[PDB]
Symmetry: D3
Subunit: 232 residues, 6 copies
Amino acid sequence: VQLQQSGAELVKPGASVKLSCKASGYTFTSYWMHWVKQRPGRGLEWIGRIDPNSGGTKYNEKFKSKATLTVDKPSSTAYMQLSSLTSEDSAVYYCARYDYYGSSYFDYWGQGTTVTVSSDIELTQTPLSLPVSLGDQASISCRSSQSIVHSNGNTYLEWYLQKPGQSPKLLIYKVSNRFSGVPDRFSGSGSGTDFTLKISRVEAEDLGVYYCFQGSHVPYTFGGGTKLEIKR
Amino acid sequence: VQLQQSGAELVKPGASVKLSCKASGYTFTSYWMHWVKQRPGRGLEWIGRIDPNSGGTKYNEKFKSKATLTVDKPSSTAYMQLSSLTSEDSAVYYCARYDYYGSSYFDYWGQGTTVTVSSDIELTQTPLSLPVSLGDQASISCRSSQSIVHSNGNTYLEWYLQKPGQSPKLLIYKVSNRFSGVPDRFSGSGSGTDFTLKISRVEAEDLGVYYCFQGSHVPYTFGGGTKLEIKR
Amino acid sequence: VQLQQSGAELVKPGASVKLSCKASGYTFTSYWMHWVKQRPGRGLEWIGRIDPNSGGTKYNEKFKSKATLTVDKPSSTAYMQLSSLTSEDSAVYYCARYDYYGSSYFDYWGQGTTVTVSSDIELTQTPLSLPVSLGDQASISCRSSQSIVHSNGNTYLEWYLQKPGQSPKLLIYKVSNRFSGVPDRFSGSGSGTDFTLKISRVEAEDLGVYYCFQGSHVPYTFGGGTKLEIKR
Amino acid sequence: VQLQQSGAELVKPGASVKLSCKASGYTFTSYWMHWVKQRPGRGLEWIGRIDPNSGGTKYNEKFKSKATLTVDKPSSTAYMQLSSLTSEDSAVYYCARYDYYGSSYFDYWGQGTTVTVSSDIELTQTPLSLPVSLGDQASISCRSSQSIVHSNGNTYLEWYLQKPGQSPKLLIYKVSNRFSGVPDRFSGSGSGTDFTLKISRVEAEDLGVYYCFQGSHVPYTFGGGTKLEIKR
Amino acid sequence: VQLQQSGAELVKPGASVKLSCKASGYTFTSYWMHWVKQRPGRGLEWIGRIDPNSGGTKYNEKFKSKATLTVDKPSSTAYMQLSSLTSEDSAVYYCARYDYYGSSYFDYWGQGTTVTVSSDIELTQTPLSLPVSLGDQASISCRSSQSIVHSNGNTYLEWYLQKPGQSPKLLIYKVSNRFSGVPDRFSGSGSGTDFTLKISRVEAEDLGVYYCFQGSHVPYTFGGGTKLEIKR
Amino acid sequence: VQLQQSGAELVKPGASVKLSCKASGYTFTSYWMHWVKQRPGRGLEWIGRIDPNSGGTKYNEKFKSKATLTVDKPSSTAYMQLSSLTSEDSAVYYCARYDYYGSSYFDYWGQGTTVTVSSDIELTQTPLSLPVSLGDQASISCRSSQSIVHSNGNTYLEWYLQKPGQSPKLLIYKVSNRFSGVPDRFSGSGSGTDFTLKISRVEAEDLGVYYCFQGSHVPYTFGGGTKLEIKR
């Protein structure tokens, strides 16, 4: 035999993690140990191997800078240290025993350890272009891939307006609060993962590019932008 | 408040640059400072932030190896050091003040600093294939994405011919000069960004792949090649 | 002249290699030397240059971390050290003499040195999905991009079956040998680069994803998988 | 020539700096430029050089990872970028013009640019060993290489006691304030760079190693320690 | 409160370790957490700190490449990852809670976590010089800092002789076994950490430098050497 | 068995080298191969080993970043690549065959390959302090560890004077030539590795620190300095 692996891991990009594989039912030092990777619905890959008796190793060139293999004879345990994790590293990792002789590569497998690296929040803004007539009403959409609610209860969703050649300016903060000096024609609403910015009556000074932003979970991200322009 | 940023930067790939953001109209140490990136017509990205009072920082994992944030209390100035610049780094960079409390992320913005990383010169060669009959005339085109004139007044545009299985051989240098031993059937012309190689009467020994080259601005680059082959 | 280059190189990913270019028929220290790269049917690229007299160098930013140029005056030889080789590095490399003055960049070329970095073995498995009726016969294909025969004479081609939510289990090893406990309804055959797994009569417990694997040449690789599922 | 260098730089460890050297009185591109280092009363070292005409460079192997040389032709200015500065980098840096024919090395010198990397604060604690009789009064000294006063007005000088087999525990904070539980027999005094801890009547529980600590300027540092033991 | 740290770690050079610090008795997110290092009888050093609420961090420049700080809000636990450990990393590591208003630095301390990086085995060989008369008996000592016994039961202690101008050659293996060709005049004895080599009757061919060697625990090491020369 | 190693290597700092070890008299793949280092009169160190059959390797942690081991089965040759060489890398490197059953370590040795990394030139300047009376004659010595003669025939030995509060200024170039403005009272002489600077009649303006410098072999270096002061 049996190969027992450590529990599930949940980490953020850049983190490191050390997985273990304990062996029983045979002489640990008499068989080699391999490690295999399996991405969500993508396929299997060979990482490398170690001989527990002498400590010699051999790696897949692709994973040489990402993984390090070791063993602890007294406890009959094999380890794999992973560093600088990225989204491409989310997978189920297995340890497998190599035969006593040299024919079969993986005769006994551990149950596997799932390692999930968190995904950045994506903000989808629609539409990309919004032609309007002065005096008309307008509405812009901003939806997130995950909840924007912070553990402290606040939802840090904001809206900015960038005029041609200038830097962005704050309009709305915390979903529905207007910044000091912003006209009441602007209003924000929504919650969780769906938000909306509305303009009751469009003025000439309102034309430009609008952006939504979330400051609830790192890394903080911005929407793609919506260009409000004169209809013609 | 007011945030005044440093002037425009023009650099080549691999260079480093340090941007500054001076604050006035408030107590510098009482508010946090963030830095934002905006690529030409692509969108906004959050880089990271620093607390001027204690010096603590938090970065977007994506930019951790590219940027370093610091401050100088006496002059109330914030700095961002960028290293190993590439074409993907050309953008307008902004500094923005974080509220006294914690609601709004960017209530006051600097005017921004544009950082332009120079682009490599691309040589477009046409046609890719040119079938010809022995005895015929031939003409090949080579156009550059930027001027090939050097500050010293010379235009280092050259033409090479590579026969099957052999190394390239020089034909023309400095736009229109024939190398010692090259037949007068070969002539080159052009200037600035558009060049042409002509062959008055094609001989069997002329078949192979022709390449244009520019040695005026680093990195020196070659065109994609034109294969002159027997018509059939 | 004459520029004589060193012989062909055959290496695996991650390796390093040092190429040489010996000059004769002129005063070595009186002309600069450049190095050029040419990938299989892709085009020419400028790497960098060195002045043999003073030792000064100038590099294409793209190759600065990959190559280092040096010279040995007594033997009139120029060298280029390449490190951390990858498949993108397989090419023919040339050394070329820069004029005495500054007009023509490459008036005399060496014959070139071909550097080939070995390619990983790819296992193509077909079909991706195989719907079947219980009791029917089934056949799965696995073909390799290169021979799976090891120098010692064995062919380490194996087959694995992964049931929903479980780890893979060994079925066949060394092309046609059944693992202890595997029913005789499973049989494997083939050699060289083409292999087949057959099931005489499909049972309910046989449904899942089948994978072929090769442990003959590093890095060891797996096929893409075939999902055997109930016909409906 | 005349060679005008940029002003003094006061930086903390880890920072980078970019120095300039403006040339006048001759044709900038016709002469090579060298850079030299001089540490406080220690001697001279050659860093490297650049040819402004072609852009080629040559470095002292020791400084290859630390310095990068570039030039700007239009403004007749040479630059030297230094990165990841440490205490061993504090020095006066000079630029110097090479002879036209390379007959001599440093014909004309700039006035120099002083770069100072800040030194960490060192707390000298006296005495290392302090044997006392039960009931006696004890006195410990802590003197610093730099003022412990912070720009906000406070002086973060503290005193800790580590009893045998235990972790340290706080005794005095902000020079003279007692933490919770601390006996009135302990008192602290001092200002700027000189401080003292006094124990009015030594008891068995007072025995161990005392440490002074400063939390005013990064990196925060501790004194060497004082072992209080009895003259049994 | 209470700050509970993880158990002792015994690691070899090159490994990484992740330490935890569980907090109870107060609101985890309301106070900053610091980390401190204490080498065996050497003093205290400040590593860095993290604000559990916002996630900002500040490091001692010296430890920036060695340590990474993170927190897990739900479980009220702080973490410190140490990488590429060396002998200078062996120490007791502590976590400590900052004052609510930052008036003092380390108000409450964890019990500490001991991290021991294994030391290489040192073979002390005596004497450095050994003048003898032809025909005399010679004796050489080799004592180790750790037992040369391997878990498999064997003791890989060997003796080598390097004759002037030649490469070393094996004399004795597994403490007392003679290699091929070795004269019966050479004999080895000893066990555990103390060994001896004896030469019954010194001959001219015996002159040179003798070395003891241990191949039981990585890295394998040699003794300093003993030069056998005649008292002419 | 016989183990034939490649010839001597003379390299400059920063270079890389690849050593070979050809085996004969036994089946190459049936025995492990070890590599050992021996610095000039300093002792022996174990680098690492490789199993030619499976390709597994084990390194001494100290040399992991410096050495890489590989084998070529067809030619029965083992290789060791060393990179980024420094002065501490100069030594004789050996390959040695392991026992068939691992009973002993280095059973058969190659003849060794000497690798010499060139040392920088050291200029010893005497005396460090030189008190003189106004009007007296002064003499300064500068002797080198290697010849200052360049392959082109010239000897780039120079003398500089740094007046209090000023930058250095050139006095003598090419051993005995006076720079512009330099008084006739200054004269230089010498050749090869021994040089002298003489001042016929010391004046107040002559006071300061004198430095000899060599610009013949990289890295260019300065002498320690001589402070000329008056015996007031």
